[PDB]
Structure 1
Amino acid sequence: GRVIRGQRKGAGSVFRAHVKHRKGAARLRAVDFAERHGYIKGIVKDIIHDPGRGAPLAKVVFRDPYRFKKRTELFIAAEGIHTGQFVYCGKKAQLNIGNVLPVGTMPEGTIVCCLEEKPGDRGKLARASGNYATVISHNPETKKTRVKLPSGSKKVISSANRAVVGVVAGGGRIDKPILKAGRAYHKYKAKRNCWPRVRGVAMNPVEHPFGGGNHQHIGKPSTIRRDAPAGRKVGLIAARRTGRLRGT
């Protein structure tokens, strides 16, 4: 009769993200006349560390094309970006690393990142540390650029939506082992309350549907229905195939 941990996680208060020292929302620049019809120049001020993000960020200070002010945008830092590098953004901007442009105006087999899945959403795809999205093909009619994603699944996109050229920085951080539990404690204090993972077989039967028993077992198949209700849906969710994977 007690709510399971996942149901409690959904509420808030405790299982929310620790957004205090987070150095801001990593997003692209907003589309205007200087993005759609040509390009605009803005300098990389400083590559910076975002607590709760594996990849670093970049304060890229553009000049405002309308106002006397000078705008500053928090980009996902492409691997090989540096301070005082000119990063150009728009249609007529060149095809080199950091130099963001819409996917219709770059060839196929091109590595992108911080890619818009819908035109305007301002950077959503392939934008964790070291992830590369390829430009598979083009469809000049209907604007359908097929894009291979870090998962591997190809997405038909609207070909008028912008990605920063090159892979995201902080690449290959999952190669280093967390050797001691303390390093993992410090990793998840930066993000949200989810780390010290209590396995269901250890939990009592009132808390978790894998609980109880004089032996520490499951007893029921852990592979569960997609329809399965709020609290029961536990273990291998809607598992097509399960057990040990061999080859491809």
Structure 2
Amino acid sequence: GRVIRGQRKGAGSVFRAHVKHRKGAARLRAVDFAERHGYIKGIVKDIIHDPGRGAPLAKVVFRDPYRFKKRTELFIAAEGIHTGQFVYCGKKAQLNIGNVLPVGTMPEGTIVCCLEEKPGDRGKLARASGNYATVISHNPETKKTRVKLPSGSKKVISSANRAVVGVVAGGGRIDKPILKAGRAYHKYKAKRNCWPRVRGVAMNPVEHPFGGGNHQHIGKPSTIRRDAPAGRKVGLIAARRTGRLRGTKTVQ
């Protein structure tokens, strides 16, 4: 009869993201004439650590092509850039690490990251630390571009959206074991209040469909369909196949 923990997550009362010490949203520059009919050069001031994120944030200063003012943007620092390196943003920019340019111009097999789903989405895909997307196809007519995302999915996107070249800095971040609960607590304290993660079979039937019984067992098939109501989707959600995997999943 009581709302479960996974159901209380959507209320946003105490489960809000700790966004106090966040430096800024990681987004690219706005598409304009100086970007679609040439390129502009900017200077990287410094890279900083964003709490709750493994990818560093590089501050880049560009010169406004219309007003006398310097524009500061926060990009995702690709691995292999240093303070003082000139970063070029535009259509006819040279293919180098750090420079952003539309995917319709780069050749096949280009390892890029921080791209956009739609032209103007301003850097939404492949933003985690050490991830990249691989361009595999091109279409001159009916402009489309096939990319392979870090999840292995091959998605077709527009040929006008941009992507910075290179892999995100901070790779291999998951190779280190947390090695104790204190480091996990300090990690999740900057992200959000979701760490304790009490098992469902430990509590009572009032707070979870799995709790109860004199023996700490589930009693019901953990595989639950997609049509289950709120507060009922627990355990595996529409598990098409369970158990230890045998090779590659190869699912589209």
TM-score of the superposed pair, with normalisation by structure 1: 0.99
Structure 1 residue 123: Cα displacement: 0.4
1:25-74 alpha-carbon deviations (Å, 9 max, x no partner): 00000001011111000011101100011110100011111000100000
> In 1, distance between residues paired with 2:99 and 2:61?
14
| Secondary structure, aligned partner of 1:71 | strand
| Secondary structure, aligned partner of 1:87 | strand
> In 2, distance between residues paired with 1:221 and 1:94?
56
Structure 1 residue 246: Cα displacement: 1.4
Structure 1 residue 6: Cα displacement: 1.3
Q: How many residues align?
A: 247
> In 2, distance between residues paired with 1:37 and 1:123?
20
1:177-228 alpha-carbon deviations (Å, 9 max, x no partner): 1001000000100100000110100111000001101010101000101110
Runs (4+) of structure 1 exceeding 4 A deviation are: none
Structure 1 residue 144: Cα displacement: 1.0
| Secondary structure, aligned partner of 1:89 | strand
Runs (5+) with no aligned partner, structure 2: 248-252
Structure 1 residue 86: Cα displacement: 0.3
| Secondary structure, aligned partner of 1:88 | strand
Task: Using the aligned pairs only, state the percent identity.
Answer: 100
Counterpart for residue 207 of structure 2: 207
Runs (5+) with no aligned partner, structure 1: none
Structure 1 residue 237: Cα displacement: 0.6
> In 2, distance between residues paired with 1:89 and 1:105?
13
Counterpart for residue 65 of structure 1: 65
Counterpart for residue 88 of structure 2: 88
Structure 1 residue 136: Cα displacement: 0.8
> In 1, distance between residues paired with 2:218 and 2:51?
37
| Secondary structure, aligned partner of 2:210 | coil
> In 1, distance between residues paired with 2:237 and 2:95?
42
> In 2, distance between residues paired with 1:149 and 1:99?
20
1:147-191 alpha-carbon deviations (Å, 9 max, x no partner): 000000011000100111001111111001100100000010010
> In 2, distance between residues paired with 1:37 and 1:208?
58
CA RMSD of aligned residues (A): 0.6
TM-score of the superposed pair, with normalisation by structure 2: 0.97
Structure 1 residue 243: Cα displacement: 1.0
> In 1, distance between residues paired with 2:169 and 2:62?
21
> In 2, distance between residues paired with 1:134 and 1:182?
37
1:72-105 alpha-carbon deviations (Å, 9 max, x no partner): 0000000001101000001010111101100001
> In 2, distance between residues paired with 1:34 and 1:199?
54
Structure 1 residue 13: Cα displacement: 1.9
Structure 1 residue 141: Cα displacement: 1.1
Counterpart for residue 177 of structure 1: 177
Counterpart for residue 29 of structure 1: 29
Structure 1 residue 7: Cα displacement: 1.2
| Secondary structure, aligned partner of 2:30 | coil
